[PDB]
């Protein structure tokens, strides 16, 4: 009778006096022991309390209500057993009054609760607290601190991190920590107006250890690696480019500046998990990532871009041109063979077999490790046809020429993949792929169905008796009719008043309609092409091309052993304060606008030495 | 895109009007919901998100926040 | 200000229908041709008037064409006014009965915006959906 009355008095929140008298009545009925009054107050369905109902149902009078409730629970000495209570429901599981208070954005109440013994490290392990599909659910990391972080509440963060009972390194049921959550939540700069970066910065400045970023989730990944697996970009620019003038916390900053005489300076960066060394790397992770269209802007950053360029200027260009030369000689030998069909031919055939086996096994391992990858399957099909041709060549078969030739032509087509090297030719080949993927397929499919329709039509009309003469009957065979149509679309077709036909007029009309429809259809693939190209041509070409370049570069780099790799490392070690040694990539940049004296610099002597 | 979605909508409604009332009654996307003052009416639940403006929600019908 | 005066005057007749059969809100719905031309003052007046009259009577009426002002908003190209009419959320607990846009579920940036389908569900002899989609001009 009273419990519903309590919940309604709280839902309205109109009177504390109602709750004063009703609490007097509760204390009177408590003659029966704390669990008795606790259950009398508690909702046995979800485990919910009044205080939860209070901080859900908000009004101006709430603060007084909270003071009343807490003083009451303190006089009854159930303060600990009450506040730390959490829901028993599945989705609701674990969330306390504090998380409710913060979802409703009331800080002072949170201070009162913390002063009253609130549990800050309480985890929320539930469906709503650990959902999937990113809809009908909200994931903040399952700790209150992360909630205040995601919700742009710095003061509460200062409080919590000022309290000693707080656990900063607490990992959730998903294995993630604070920073992982923020990395999950940085969807875009525009939507959030970039407050999270400020929170990340404040938190690191409040915790002077590497412990957090050194952690790994249950997926086995750092928050940085989590940013790579995600599309977080603006946060990532901060994570890599980090400069701190404070000499106490300077050990954290990855962006160092040791050399400055003026507008010119050396911005020195750190490569620890990025150098493609320890079982994964931000570079490898990003480049091999999928379901992320922001990979371009990720790679536009200073350290990664310069790494790729340094490696290309170190070795990779040589390897690319080298493979190009091998494949060039290969397919040329194949042409000589196919055109002329002593000791030199035998050695050449052996080389062909060996090289084919090499590429075939490479593409097989690639597929096993598996449309940007469209080339691999093509090379594989080529090499397969080659070995098949070799087999059929030895045997008394007539089909050896067919597979051979098909593979040869396919290889000359694959030459475009090597044309992807040059900058202009790169965007050109990207245009080839984009065209043949998006634009043309519609045209070909619909053209083909038109072709089949008008073909059966013409064939039926032509079905009149040839009169014992095949030449008298054009369009006789369905395939022949379709051939005539395609020949006409080229412009070689034979247009004539048909013979051995019941309705020559209708024949002509249908033919003309086919021509006109084909023409306008061509015009419409063209119009769609221009519309997509006017924007997608320039931008998408460069980005996707550089992406492909990076992927291939890393492929070449993974083909090599460790010792050669160790010799070709672009990383140059550099000392840092507090006996801190770390690998780094030196870069030199210039800024003519902002004149800011360099107080923080490692290398006294300003020069490359 | 605009005219296409218009055509989609028109033909969707054509199909929908092709059907009888009982089947239609079974396929109704409307989910009834109670409202204050004993006010009952049909409604469509939607879930949206806003990261910019943080405004505490004082007015909300369902106390227990979940779809159960 | 003059609207405040008139609606404070007791002799006023709010529900008065014209010789064309239209009511007050019908007129405004005819009036708001575009957002750019009027700088969107009409939605403010619609809001003020409904807040000054706490009944469903107006929106429940039909013109001599047999159409709600909402239905008239469909028959015309009124868009922003329609966005207001459908997306209508009122924190005032006295007039909360009017607001069609409800918010019953919120833990944070996530929320459930619950909307009303009374005359829109293609049920009673016409609907805003059907009217609009089958409309021309």
UniProtKB/Swiss-Prot annotation, chain B:
Cytoplasmic side: 1-68
Primary role: Non-selective calcium permeant cation channel. It is activated by innocuous (warm) temperatures and shows an increased response at noxious temperatures greater than 39 degrees Celsius. Activation exhibits an outward rectification. The channel pore can dilate to provide permeability to larger cations. May associate with TRPV1 and may modulate its activity. Is a negative regulator of hair growth and cycling: TRPV3-coupled signaling suppresses keratinocyte proliferation in hair follicles and induces apoptosis and premature hair follicle regression (catagen).
Organism the protein comes from: Homo sapiens (Human)
Disease note: Olmsted syndrome 1: An autosomal dominant, rare congenital disorder characterized by bilateral mutilating palmoplantar keratoderma and periorificial keratotic plaques with severe itching at all lesions. Diffuse alopecia, constriction of digits, and onychodystrophy have also been reported. Infections and squamous cell carcinomas can arise on the keratotic areas. The digital constriction may progress to autoamputation of fingers and toes. Palmoplantar keratoderma, non-epidermolytic, focal 2: A dermatological disorder characterized by non-epidermolytic, abnormal thickening of the skin on the palms and soles. Focal palmoplantar keratoderma consists of localized areas of hyperkeratosis located mainly on pressure points and sites of recurrent friction.
Included range, full protein: 689 to 756 of 790
S-S bridge residues: none
Tissue specificity: Abundantly expressed in CNS. Widely expressed at low levels. Detected in dorsal root ganglion (at protein level). Expressed in the keratinocyte layers of the outer root sheath and, to lesser extent, to the matrix of the hair follicles (at protein level).
Name the record gives this protein: Transient receptor potential cation channel subfamily V member 3
Family: Belongs to the transient receptor (TC 1.A.4) family. TrpV subfamily. TRPV3 sub-subfamily.
Subunit composition and interactions: Homotetramer. May convert from a homotetramer to a homopentamer to allow pore dilation. Interacts with TRPV1; may form a heteromeric channel with TRPV1. Interacts with SNX11; this interaction promotes TRPV3 trafficking from the cell membrane to lysosome for degradation.
Compartments it resides in: Cell membrane; Cytoplasm; Lysosome
Swiss-Prot record, chain C:
Role summary: Non-selective calcium permeant cation channel. It is activated by innocuous (warm) temperatures and shows an increased response at noxious temperatures greater than 39 degrees Celsius. Activation exhibits an outward rectification. The channel pore can dilate to provide permeability to larger cations. May associate with TRPV1 and may modulate its activity. Is a negative regulator of hair growth and cycling: TRPV3-coupled signaling suppresses keratinocyte proliferation in hair follicles and induces apoptosis and premature hair follicle regression (catagen).
Originating organism: Homo sapiens
Family in the record: Belongs to the transient receptor (TC 1.A.4) family. TrpV subfamily. TRPV3 sub-subfamily.
Assembly and oligomerization: Homotetramer. May convert from a homotetramer to a homopentamer to allow pore dilation. Interacts with TRPV1; may form a heteromeric channel with TRPV1. Interacts with SNX11; this interaction promotes TRPV3 trafficking from the cell membrane to lysosome for degradation.
Top-level taxon of the source organism: Eukaryota
Localization in the cell: Cell membrane; Cytoplasm; Lysosome
ANK repeat feature ranges: 23-55, 65-87, 123-137
Section covered of the full-length record: 276 to 412 of 790
UniProt gene name: TRPV3
Disorder this protein is connected to according to its UniProt record: Olmsted syndrome 1: An autosomal dominant, rare congenital disorder characterized by bilateral mutilating palmoplantar keratoderma and periorificial keratotic plaques with severe itching at all lesions. Diffuse alopecia, constriction of digits, and onychodystrophy have also been reported. Infections and squamous cell carcinomas can arise on the keratotic areas. The digital constriction may progress to autoamputation of fingers and toes. Palmoplantar keratoderma, non-epidermolytic, focal 2: A dermatological disorder characterized by non-epidermolytic, abnormal thickening of the skin on the palms and soles. Focal palmoplantar keratoderma consists of localized areas of hyperkeratosis located mainly on pressure points and sites of recurrent friction.
UniProt name for this protein: Transient receptor potential cation channel subfamily V member 3
Tissues in which the protein is found: Abundantly expressed in CNS. Widely expressed at low levels. Detected in dorsal root ganglion (at protein level). Expressed in the keratinocyte layers of the outer root sheath and, to lesser extent, to the matrix of the hair follicles (at protein level).
């Amino acid at each position: 009778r009273l419990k519903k009355r309590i919940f309604a008095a709280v839902s309205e929140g109109c009177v504390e006096e109602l709750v004063e008298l009703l609490v007097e009545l509760q204390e009177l009925c408590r003659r029966r022991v704390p669990d008795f009054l606790m259950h009398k107050l508690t909702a046995s369905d979800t485990g919910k309390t009044c205080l939860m109902k209070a901080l859900l149902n908000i009004n101006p009078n709430t603060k007084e209500i909270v003071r009343i409730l807490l003083a009451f629970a303190e006089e009854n000495d159930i303060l600990g057993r009450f506040i730390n209570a959490e829901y028993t429901e599945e989705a609701y599981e674990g969330q306390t009054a504090l998380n409710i208070a913060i979802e409703r954005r009331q800080g002072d109440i949170a201070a009162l609760l913390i002063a009253a013994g609130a549990d800050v490290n309480a985890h929320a392990k539930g469906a709503f607290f650990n959902p999937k599909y990113q809809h009908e659910g909200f994931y903040f990391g399952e700790t209150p601190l992360a909630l205040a972080a995601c919700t742009n509440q710095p003061e509460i963060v200062q409080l919590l991190m000022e309290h000693e009972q707080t656990d900063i390194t607490s990992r959730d049921s998903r294995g993630n920590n604070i920073l992982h959550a923020l990395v999950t939540v940085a969807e875009d700069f525009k939507t959030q107006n970039d407050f999270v970066k400020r929170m990340y910065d404040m938190i690191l400045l409040r915790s002077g250890n590497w412990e957090l970023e050194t952690t790994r989730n249950n997926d086995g990944l750092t928050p940085l690696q989590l940013a790579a697996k995600m599309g977080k970009a603006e946060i990532l620019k901060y994570i890599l480019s980090r400069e701190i003038k404070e000499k106490r916390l300077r050990s954290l900053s990855r962006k160092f500046t040791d050399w400055a005489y003026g507008p010119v300076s050396s911005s020195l960066y750190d490569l620890t998990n990025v150098d493609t060394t320890t079982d994964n790397s931000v570079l490898e992770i990003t480049v091999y990532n999928t379901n992320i269209d922001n990979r371009h802007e990720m790679l536009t950053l200073e350290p990664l871009h310069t790494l790729l360029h340094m490696k290309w200027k170190k070795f990779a260009k040589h390897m690319f041109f080298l493979s190009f030369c091998f494949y060039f000689f290969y397919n040329i030998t194949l042409t000589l063979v196919s055109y002329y069909r002593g000791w030199l031919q035998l050695l050449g055939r052996m080389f062909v077999l060996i090289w084919a086996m090499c590429i075939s096994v490479k593409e097989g391992i690639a597929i096993f490790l598996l449309s940007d990858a469209w080339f691999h399957f093509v090379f594989f099909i080529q090499a397969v046809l080659v070995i098949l041709s070799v087999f059929l060549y030895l045997f008394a078969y007539k089909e050896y020429l067919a597979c051979l030739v098909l593979a040869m032509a396919l290889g000359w087509a694959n030459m475009l993949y090597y044309t992807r090297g040059f900058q202009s030719m790169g965007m050109y080949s990207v245009m080839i792929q984009k065209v043949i993927l998006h634009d043309v397929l519609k045209f070909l499919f619909v053209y083909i169905v038109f072709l089949l329709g008008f073909g059966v039509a013409l064939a039926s009309l032509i079905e009149k008796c040839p009169k014992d003469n095949k030449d008298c009957s054009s369009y006789g065979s369905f395939s022949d009719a379709v051939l005539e149509l395609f020949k006409l679309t080229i412009g070689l077709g034979d247009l004539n008043i048909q013979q051995n036909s019941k309705y020559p007029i209708l024949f002509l009309f249908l033919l003309i309609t086919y021509v006109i429809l084909t023409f306008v259809l061509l015009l419409n693939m063209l119009i769609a092409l221009m519309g997509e190209t006017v924007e997608n041509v320039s931008k998408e070409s460069e980005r996707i091309w550089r992406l492909q370049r990076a992927r291939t570069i890393l492929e070449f780099e993974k083909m090599l052993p460790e010792w050669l790799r160790s010799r070709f490392r672009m990383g140059e070690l550099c000392k840092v304060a507090e006996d801190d040694f770390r690998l780094c990539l030196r870069i030199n940049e210039v800024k003519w606008t902002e004149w800011k004296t360099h107080v923080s610099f490692l290398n006294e002597d300003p020069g490359p030495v």
